[PDB]
Amino acid sequence: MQKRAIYPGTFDPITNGHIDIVTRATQMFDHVILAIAASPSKKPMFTLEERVALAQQATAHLGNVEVVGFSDLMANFARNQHATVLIRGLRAVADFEYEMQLAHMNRHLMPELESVFLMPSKEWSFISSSLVKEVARHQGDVTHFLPENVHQALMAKLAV
Amino acid sequence: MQKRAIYPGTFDPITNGHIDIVTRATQMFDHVILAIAASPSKKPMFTLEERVALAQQATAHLGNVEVVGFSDLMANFARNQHATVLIRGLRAVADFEYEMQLAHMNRHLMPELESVFLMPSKEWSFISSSLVKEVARHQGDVTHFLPENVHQALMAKLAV
Amino acid sequence: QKRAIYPGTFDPITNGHIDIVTRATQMFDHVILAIAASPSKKPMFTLEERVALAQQATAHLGNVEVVGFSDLMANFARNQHATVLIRGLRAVADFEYEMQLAHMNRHLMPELESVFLMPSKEWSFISSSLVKEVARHQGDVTHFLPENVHQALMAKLA
Amino acid sequence: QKRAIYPGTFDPITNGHIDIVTRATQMFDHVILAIAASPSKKPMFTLEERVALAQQATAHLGNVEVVGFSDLMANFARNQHATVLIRGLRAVADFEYEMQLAHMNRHLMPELESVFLMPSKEWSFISSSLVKEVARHQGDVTHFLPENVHQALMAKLA
Amino acid sequence: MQKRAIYPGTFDPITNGHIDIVTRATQMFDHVILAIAASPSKKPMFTLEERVALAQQATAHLGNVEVVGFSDLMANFARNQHATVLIRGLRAVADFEYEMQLAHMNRHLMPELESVFLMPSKEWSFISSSLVKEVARHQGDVTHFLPENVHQALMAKLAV
Amino acid sequence: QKRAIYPGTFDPITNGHIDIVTRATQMFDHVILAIAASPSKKPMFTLEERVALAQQATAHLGNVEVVGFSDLMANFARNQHATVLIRGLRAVADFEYEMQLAHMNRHLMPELESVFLMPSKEWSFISSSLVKEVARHQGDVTHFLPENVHQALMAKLA
Ligand SMILES: COc1ccc2[nH]cc(CCNC(=O)C(C)(C)C)c2c1
Numbered sequence: 001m002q003k004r005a006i007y008p009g010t011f012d013p014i015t016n017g018h019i020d021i022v023t024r025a026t027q028m029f030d031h032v033i034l035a036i037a038a039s040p041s042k043k044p045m046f047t048l049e050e051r052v053a054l055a056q057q058a059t060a061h062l063g064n065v066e067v068v069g070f071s072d073l074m075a076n077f078a079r080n081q082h083a084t085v086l087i088r089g090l091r092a093v094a095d096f097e098y099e100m101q102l103a104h105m106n107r108h109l110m111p112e113l114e115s116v117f118l119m120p121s122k123e124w125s126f127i128s129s130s131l132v133k134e135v136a137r138h139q140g141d142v143t144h145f146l147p148e149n150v151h152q153a154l155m156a157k158l159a160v
Numbered sequence: 161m162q163k164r165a166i167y168p169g170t171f172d173p174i175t176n177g178h179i180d181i182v183t184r185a186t187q188m189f190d191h192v193i194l195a196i197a198a199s200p201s202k203k204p205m206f207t208l209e210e211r212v213a214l215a216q217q218a219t220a221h222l223g224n225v226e227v228v229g230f231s232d233l234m235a236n237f238a239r240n241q242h243a244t245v246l247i248r249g250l251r252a253v254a255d256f257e258y259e260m261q262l263a264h265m266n267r268h269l270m271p272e273l274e275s276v277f278l279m280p281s282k283e284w285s286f287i288s289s290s291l292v293k294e295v296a297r298h299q300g301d302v303t304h305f306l307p308e309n310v311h312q313a314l315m316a317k318l319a320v
Numbered sequence: 321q322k323r324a325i326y327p328g329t330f331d332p333i334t335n336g337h338i339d340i341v342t343r344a345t346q347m348f349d350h351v352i353l354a355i356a357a358s359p360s361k362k363p364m365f366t367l368e369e370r371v372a373l374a375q376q377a378t379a380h381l382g383n384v385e386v387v388g389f390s391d392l393m394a395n396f397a398r399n400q401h402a403t404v405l406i407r408g409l410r411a412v413a414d415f416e417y418e419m420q421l422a423h424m425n426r427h428l429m430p431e432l433e434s435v436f437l438m439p440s441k442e443w444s445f446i447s448s449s450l451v452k453e454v455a456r457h458q459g460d461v462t463h464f465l466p467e468n469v470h471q472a473l474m475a476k477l478a
Numbered sequence: 479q480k481r482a483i484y485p486g487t488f489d490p491i492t493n494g495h496i497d498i499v500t501r502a503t504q505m506f507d508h509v510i511l512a513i514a515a516s517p518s519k520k521p522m523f524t525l526e527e528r529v530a531l532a533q534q535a536t537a538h539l540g541n542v543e544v545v546g547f548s549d550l551m552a553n554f555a556r557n558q559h560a561t562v563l564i565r566g567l568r569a570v571a572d573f574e575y576e577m578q579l580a581h582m583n584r585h586l587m588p589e590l591e592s593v594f595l596m597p598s599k600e601w602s603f604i605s606s607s608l609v610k611e612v613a614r615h616q617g618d619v620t621h622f623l624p625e626n627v628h629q630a631l632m633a634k635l636a
Numbered sequence: 637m638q639k640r641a642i643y644p645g646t647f648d649p650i651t652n653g654h655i656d657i658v659t660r661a662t663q664m665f666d667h668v669i670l671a672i673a674a675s676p677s678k679k680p681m682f683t684l685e686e687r688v689a690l691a692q693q694a695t696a697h698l699g700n701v702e703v704v705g706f707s708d709l710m711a712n713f714a715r716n717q718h719a720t721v722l723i724r725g726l727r728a729v730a731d732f733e734y735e736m737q738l739a740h741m742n743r744h745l746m747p748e749l750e751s752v753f754l755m756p757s758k759e760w761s762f763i764s765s766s767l768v769k770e771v772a773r774h775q776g777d778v779t780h781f782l783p784e785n786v787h788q789a790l791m792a793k794l795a796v
Numbered sequence: 797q798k799r800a801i802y803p804g805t806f807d808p809i810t811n812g813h814i815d816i817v818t819r820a821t822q823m824f825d826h827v828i829l830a831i832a833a834s835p836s837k838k839p840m841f842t843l844e845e846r847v848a849l850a851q852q853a854t855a856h857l858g859n860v861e862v863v864g865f866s867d868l869m870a871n872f873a874r875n876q877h878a879t880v881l882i883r884g885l886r887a888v889a890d891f892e893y894e895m896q897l898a899h900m901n902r903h904l905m906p907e908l909e910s911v912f913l914m915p916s917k918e919w920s921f922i923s924s925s926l927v928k929e930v931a932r933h934q935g936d937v938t939h940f941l942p943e944n945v946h947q948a949l950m951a952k953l954a
Pocket residue numbers: 008009010037039072073074075102105106294295298
């Protein structure tokens with residue numbers, strides 16, 4: 001079986017937790033699409049072009065990762081990408097509840113897209129893009145949670 | 161005992177999950193007030209008049225349902241409506257936590273108003289007005305989650 | 321005439337159970353407090369002791385009927401012509417199991433509606449199990465139990 | 479050739495387990511449904527009964543292999559050359575224990591990736607334990623089990 | 637050991653739940669800094685000066701409490717205050733999840749600052765500043781949840 | 797002089813317990829690591845074995861006192877003149893039970909303040925129960941336990 005999997009999200013910015021999940025996905029599936037949502041409702045810190053470029057560079061060492069931006073409903077994009085596997089990272093209980101609702105909805109929308117939940121390292125089990133940004137905004141050290149290129153862009157973003 | 165129960169919420173829009181809960185409430189209590197909150201803080205998709213009209217039409221087949229709009233504190237409205245039963249739908253754990261806080265607060269405000277928790281069908285256990293709207297905004301099919309009249313109004317709303 | 325059933329092991333009946341059954345009696349015309357034989361749990365008190373303790377602790381509530389049962393819930397509720405099943409809400413861990421039971425009970429008897437009532441903040445952190453555990457270590461449990469239940473628990477542990 | 483393992487007690491195998499293993503077979507080339515001896519749990523069905531029931535209930539799935547094991551998970555998975563470990567997602571209480579198992583299994587065998595699959599809403603509130611409990615009270619469990627499993631459960635309880 | 641503990645938060649406004657937690661902290665630690673975050677992102681009902689004055693007056697009877705405002709990352713402030721104990725109140729499961737994420741982040745930022753979780757009275761286990769304000773805005777009685785001075789300021793705030 | 801008590805079964809004491817007690821010693825002047833007789837749980841190690849293992853595993857911490865007790869928590873804490881009760885935070889399921897215990901303990905002894913400490917991410921997914929389970933299947937548990945505890949666990953399972 002030559003499986004195409006999709007790993008969607010805002011990735012604003014991509015963290016070491018996302019790198020962990022996408023690395024596990026590439027060791028399991030032949031082709032992994034890391035799909036970055038335009039997500040204008042969330043009003044992201046980084047533009048879609050910035051998020052795509054940051055994720056491309058942070059996953060460049062992974063030969064079977066394709067970084068792409070998308071604005072549709074995830075399931076509409078996934079169907080057009082011929083993906084049958086939907087990657088989700090489960091860190092804790094709060095994730096679980098919302099992720100079950102999304103997975104049942106996604107299954108209603110596209111039954112041929114199977115949601116799979118991967119578990120990150122204990123190291124990234126307590127972080128989110130939101131928390132990292134918040135700590136960074138308040139002059140806290142977030143170097144440990146981010147790829148080098150992402151850390152450099154976050155510093156540059158917060159300086160201006 | 162000739163019980164008057166109140167089922168409050170934003171109902172923006174009323175879903176099949178809300179119809180399920182209010183149908184269970186009508187089989188248990190003599191009179192059920194489906195109370196629609198003005199809720200301007202949430203900035204609803206549908207005006208109060210639209211939400212009331214949609215809920216009226218979606219519950220018309222239930223003879224002991226009264227659809228009414230309200231702007232007060234729920235408990236202030238419930239006291240003026242001579243309701244002693246407060247209907248809440250419990251879908252999952254996240255609901256549970258917030259619902260317990262609301263129920264203890266509502267009990268402090270009006271001890272004679274008893275909070276009762278009803279459980280929806282497995283079918284509606286993973287949906288919310290918020291998720292349905294989000295999927296609809298992103299060009300996803302939500303026909304299965306809504307009464308026909310609500311589906312028609314949601315399509316019309318998103319077209320303009 | 322609306323008939324509700326409040327099932328459980330009630331090993332022993334606590335102030336938390338009295339709170340839930342009192343709320344149920346203010347809402348429904350007749351409330352059956354149904355005590356499960358529950359031999360799998362290996363209860364401290366026999367079904368007869370549990371029934372007698374609950375009868376005496378609810379005697380002041382005119383619309384409560386205390387009955388013992390070994391039946392499947394759905395069957396006993398149908399046989400009792402009840403259409404409402406009362407459960408108390410405590411913790412998330414209780415809630416999850418309660419949803420599984422409620423969906424099972426609904427499959428078995430769709431006309432039996434599960435209703436969840438919320439106890440006083442006072443009883444929101446107690447269980448029959450925790451009260452027994454405190455009492456096994458000679459701790460003061462007078463506050464959590466009806467007087468007759470407290471007396472029987474002391475007598476049992478002596 | 480991607481080899482996945484779906485471990486558990488399967489005492490007995492339910493429609494929820496059939497749902498999870500069917501999803502696993504549509505994703506992975508070979509799926510080993512691994513039945514734990516689990517003597518600590520004191521199962522209703524022996525390992526041999528559990529294996530025979532699961533074999534027959536999954537016979538229609540060409541890429542499922544039913545095997546019994548008493549080994550440490552990580553060891554049996556290495557010995558079976560599997561790199562994927564399938565778990566089903568039910569409740570938060572299941573999820574928490576599943577995270578502990580998955581982190582332990584990762585410590586023991588880092589190349590064994592735990593994957594969580596979500597069952598149909600239909601089986602989201604059932605467990606082998608709850609089905610057995612319903613059956614112990616003579617309740618209708620035909621809907622939750624494969625026919626062969628239903629027949630063996632009735633025979634066992636008779 | 638002459639321990640300095642910090643109890644951070646928005647305290648918008650300080651409630652009986654916060655008074656309960658800070659009272660427990662003062663019975664355990666020599667000096668307790670009740671640290672009020674400027675928190676402009678949350679857009680607080682009360683200004684920082686109002687929140688500090690309200691908390692000062694509501695804790696005046698506690699001799700080892702110091703009420704101070706701060707705008708830094710909490711951990712940056714805590715380090716400059718020579719605090720080695722970080723007080724958090726745990727009411728319910730939802731608190732727990734977010735509090736674990738914050739505590740691991742705070743530990744990364746300042747390992748010498750130990751997070752300690754205190755449990756409030758059952759009486760305050762179902763309230764928050766947010767819920768109290770919401771009930772007050774909707775003409776509900778919140779007298780029981782607040783110190784007298786806070787209740788007076790909340791009434792005055794909502795009248796204008 | 798601030799005296800804290802860290803109670804539990806400690807069957808056996810793990811690196812997670814060592815982490816919690818080490819954090820407690822950095823915060824409080826004297827820490828009593830209190831080992832419950834806990835016969836209801838039917839422990840793998842006797843109270844004497846559990847005390848000896850914990851004594852040796854905490855010997856490097858000068859302000860730790862390891863003591864066995866069969867008393868009610870509130871009584872032993874009063875008798876030990878402690879005003880702080882240390883608990884570790886793991887999972888939501890642990891947290892819920894911990895709140896019930898803490899409210900009960902507060903009813904019994906209001907001057908005994910329950911404090912929750914958070915372990916390292918390293919020990920956030922382990923328990924004495926899970927470590928024993930891994931060891932029962934001959935799995936490598938050297939990483940989760942003090943050396944003396946690992947040796948006693950191997951000897952016990954042999
Ligand atoms: C598991 O599916 C995800 C996860 C994170 C996501 N962030 C953005 C999207 C795409 C737009 N939104 C959607 O498609 C829903 C279903 C309305 C949420 C997205 C999808």
